[PDB]
Amino acid sequence: GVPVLNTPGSNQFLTSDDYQSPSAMPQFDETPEMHIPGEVRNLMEIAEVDSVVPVNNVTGKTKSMDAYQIPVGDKTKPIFSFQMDPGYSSVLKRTLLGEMLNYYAHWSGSVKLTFLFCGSAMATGKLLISYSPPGASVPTSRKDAMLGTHIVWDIGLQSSCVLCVPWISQSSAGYITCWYQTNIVVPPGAPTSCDVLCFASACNDFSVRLLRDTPFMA
Amino acid sequence: GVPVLNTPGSNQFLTSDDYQSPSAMPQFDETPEMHIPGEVRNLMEIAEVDSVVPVNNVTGKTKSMDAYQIPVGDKTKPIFSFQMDPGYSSVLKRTLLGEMLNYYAHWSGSVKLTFLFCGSAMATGKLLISYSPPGASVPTSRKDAMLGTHIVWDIGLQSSCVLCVPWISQSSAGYITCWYQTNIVVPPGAPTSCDVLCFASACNDFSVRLLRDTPFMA
Amino acid sequence: GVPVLNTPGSNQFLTSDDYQSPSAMPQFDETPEMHIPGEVRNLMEIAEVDSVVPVNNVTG
Amino acid sequence: QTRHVVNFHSRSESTIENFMGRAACVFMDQYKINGEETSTDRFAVWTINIREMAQLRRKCEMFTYMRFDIEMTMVITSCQMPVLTHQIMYVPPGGPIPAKVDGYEWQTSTNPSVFWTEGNAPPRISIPFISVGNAYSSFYDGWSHFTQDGTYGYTTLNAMGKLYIRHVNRSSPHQITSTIRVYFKPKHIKAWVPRPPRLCPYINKRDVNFVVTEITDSRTSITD
Amino acid sequence: QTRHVVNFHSRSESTIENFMGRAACVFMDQYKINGEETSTDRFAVWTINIREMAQLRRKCEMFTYMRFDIEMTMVITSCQMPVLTHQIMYVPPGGPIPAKVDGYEWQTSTNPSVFWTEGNAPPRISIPFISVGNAYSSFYDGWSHFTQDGTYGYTTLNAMGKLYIRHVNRSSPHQITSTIRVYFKPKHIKAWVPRPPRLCPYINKRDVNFVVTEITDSRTSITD
Amino acid sequence: VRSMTLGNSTITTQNVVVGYGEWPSYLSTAEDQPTQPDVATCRFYTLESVQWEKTSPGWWWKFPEALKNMGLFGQNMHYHYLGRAGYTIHVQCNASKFHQGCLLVVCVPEAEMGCADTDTTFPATELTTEDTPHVFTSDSITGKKVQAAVCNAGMGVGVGNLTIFPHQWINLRTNNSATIVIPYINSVPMDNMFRHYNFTLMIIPFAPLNFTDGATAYVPITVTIAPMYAEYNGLRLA
């Protein structure tokens, strides 16, 4: 019949191939597909969902829900500060963003952060959210944070300030520090100490290349 | 010649394949097909045929033809009662319906029942045929059967009442009980005790998926 | 199915062949090609470059 | 298990070709390679019929008449040397049979045979609709010999042939005991005249004789 | 390593078929060839489920509902003769299982099985979407038996079958111990209802029970 | 202020999070025919109000059977063994202006929860107490019951990234009301309403409640469920 000749690679089993498998049950006709709500067609649709970031993950507050709460209410040291990279960072590694990025080796994109102030409706103050570029050093003072990139976030007007941090990739990252511009001003009835929740997702669109096994599972 | 490469699955023998078998007798020309009456082109054409259902299959009446006869002619206990599922039910498992359904694991459809009254042409009475939904409990009295689904089947007018029981599938079923609404009224010449035959088939169309080996054969 | 017959030269490994190698990472999409200056498309573009010739290559 | 909403509408698995056309093992047999030059234990026979095992036999008795090509694939093993080559000779209904492993019938040009050597894919041999009539008859309410003689129920129309299997190797230093598993499969199958399913268990492979069995499993009362 | 300009724009590797559809070894098992005629160490079982190893199990728990064809390719070895032939019998969810290496279930025509002889390419058998429902459920917050009986969390919709594997050779002079590696692969996969990733380590392969684990790794202060 | 009414139940409300972008709908066969009640069933079933103190870790309800004693919807569960619904869920908080806090109101379809001491199961009355909610706990617990520690809500996931589901934040600084519409997520078109818990409404306080020594020591959380597009199996013959 047809003269064929087997190339190198015949009668082998490459694990990652896409050949036509001979079906064991050919007569069998499978169940018709109904419409089920909430289809996922791409993994990066999970990374685009905001989720609470455990910024206050200090040594004794990680098995409770005090990990998610940033205590607000000393103006010389910042409120919080963390590396801005969803991989290899204790704060952003178990986020929905940071967990769908540990399945991959090459990823690059931007990341948006939402700071929801969960204090009273009468508490009023200012917080200064500074961003350092990936090469720069952290601000040691509030003035040195003001001279860089910042957003003086008035709490009494808006209760949710949104960032969008670019240049986030791996294959020495940024910083999101936060400072007391003013103290929390509060009437006699409302409580003095408040909390700030944080969030993280993919800002506009996220690029991600090389799939691998996750490190968390043992 | 043509560079080919054998995939995984070459030189194997999958039992369920549909490959072109090399014919051993190629010169041989087979006998022309005449028209023989009564062709079957689908198994569910056997399930649509009515056949007598052994409702009276009590411990000593299964090797005779008293299994098929429901004795008619105490108004407090029902005449007969059985699970409405052609699989795993002693009454409906050896019917033409219930026997072409034991070749399959997934089946779903409806089932119609015909009650042929085989009494005299002068005997007259009423029977109340109640249906319980697959979750409901059986009626313990005639009134509680009347408050559900029923058909007061006048024997003196029509001698054959047809049901169509839906929601019949497996992958806790219904009930067809029957009650004395009235006794069998009979003139002095005709006999007092009568019989009722039952039938079963597929009502409109029947769905059936996964072929298996039958349990009956050993 | 299709009646084939293997010729001489089947199931051998000729070192200089140009067959379609089955890719190990099919899902993987490689990095886009940027324009890098100074592409070589032929070796004889190196021979056409002048270079200094050691004529006075005496023993010392 | 639980009762689920089995919602779909399909009867493609209930057609005749999707019901009968399934490969099932119908013949295991042993056959040696050497010793006992005049012996019957050096080859296999298996007269081809549908009444082999009761699971398949039951399905062919749903229908009175049926016609179908058969496409069997043998699966041959060996125990205990060289590389072994086998021979699976299908003789038609009109065909000479061997009496010994070294008979001359094995060389008959009208008996098609496959020569499968060990290690390759299993040998597949396909046989068309041989019968003289227009269909194979599962049941034959009649007598082979005219005027109501012996042999009830056996017609010669539903004769399919035989399948003689041997080693082609003439001898061996030690004993090799090969095992063959014939996988019968109906193909391009049509079926006429449906028929009620078998109720009683099977007694013998050439008759319809039975013991009177109860209709269904019994229960206590008519109302429970 | 150093932080480079990772400049490209692609999410083709983040789709569901390019995330789940990867072959992973899910079942190693030994099975002998001879001795102990009534023994359970002459065949393999592996009830097919996604909760086999925690690396794959974690990926299937990203999503609540998913449906997919499976295409497994076995990789069979041997130790210690003739050329060996194996049998990988997939039984459906509704299917009889063997109790011994010589049971009659192995000859069931409705259980598809491949007969792979040693030396060739690995055997590949593909199984469609079997389930009764419209998708396989990774999680089932419900009870199998009505009225809150035992067996929490186990539905019968996400039953995929079993995979019985044996030698077809009846015996051998010496002992041969074969090893099989089943390579499971989802194919043509769809997935619904995303779900947060697993945080705690896995305890058992049939439940969701866990030990309370910390959210993230701890650091010294909130500002370092 | 919008005063919604359904049947003989009127509530007073003050944006809707449509779960998975779909509004519940009916299933659209003579072999199996559904019955659409429409009458009643759709009215508002206000559960008992839940007091939220400074030390409350959370709550959860398991539906559809949280409504198993709620009127005609809880009575049609006993007569039909198959059904489906949509469950518009309003969650008010009616705190004051000096109270502070934040809630996660999330629905979590198919919340298979884990036992407190593994190697065993729980007696099935630990997942649900019909109307009343099972609270979470602040730390780990033992015994044959649900591991109800927050940070690992029920399923062994992080409680912070529980936002992937249909959710709504109730920040007492800004808002007080939440509303979620959950269009019957299941792998089979109809399922039994006593075996299977289709979703798990769990309300989890991320930022804890705080106030001074003059305010009320709690904030009552009011839960209201309206079963929409509920349809059942047929009981009549064909």
Residue numbers in the entry:
A (entry chain C), B (entry chain F): 3001 to 3073, 3078 to 3175, 3187 to 3233
C (entry chain O): 3001 to 3060
D (entry chain D), E (entry chain A): 1043 to 1122, 1132 to 1275
F (entry chain B): 2013 to 2026, 2030 to 2043, 2048 to 2257
Paper passage:
The capsid proteins VP1, VP2, VP3, and VP4 originating from a single polyprotein form a protomer, the basic building block of the icosahedral capsid. The entire capsid consists of 60 such protomers, arranged in 12 pentamer units. Here we show that the exit of the RNA from the particles of echoviruses 18 and 30 requires capsid opening and results in a loss of up to three adjacent capsid protein pentamers.
Specifically, we performed cryo-EM of echovirus 18 virions exposed to pH 6.0 for 10 min, mimicking the acidic environment that the virus encounters in endosomes. Asymmetric reconstruction combined with 3D classification identified subpopulations of echovirus 18 particles that lacked up to three pentamers of capsid protein protomers. The missing pentamers always formed a single compact opening through the capsid. Reconstructions of the open particles missing one, two, or three pentamers with imposed five-fold, two-fold, and three-fold symmetries, respectively, were determined to resolutions of 3.8, 4.1, and 3.7 Å, which allowed their molecular structures to be built. Except for the missing pentamers, the open particles are similar in structure to that of the activated echovirus 18 particle: increased diameter relative to the native virus, reduced inter-pentamer contacts, absence of VP4 subunits, and holes along icosahedral two-fold symmetry axes. Residues 1–42 from the N termini of VP1 subunits, which were previously shown to interact with membranes and facilitate enterovirus genome delivery into the cytoplasm, are not resolved in the electron density map, indicating that their structures differ among particles. The N-termini of some of the VP1 subunits could reach out of the capsid through the openings formed by the missing pentamers.
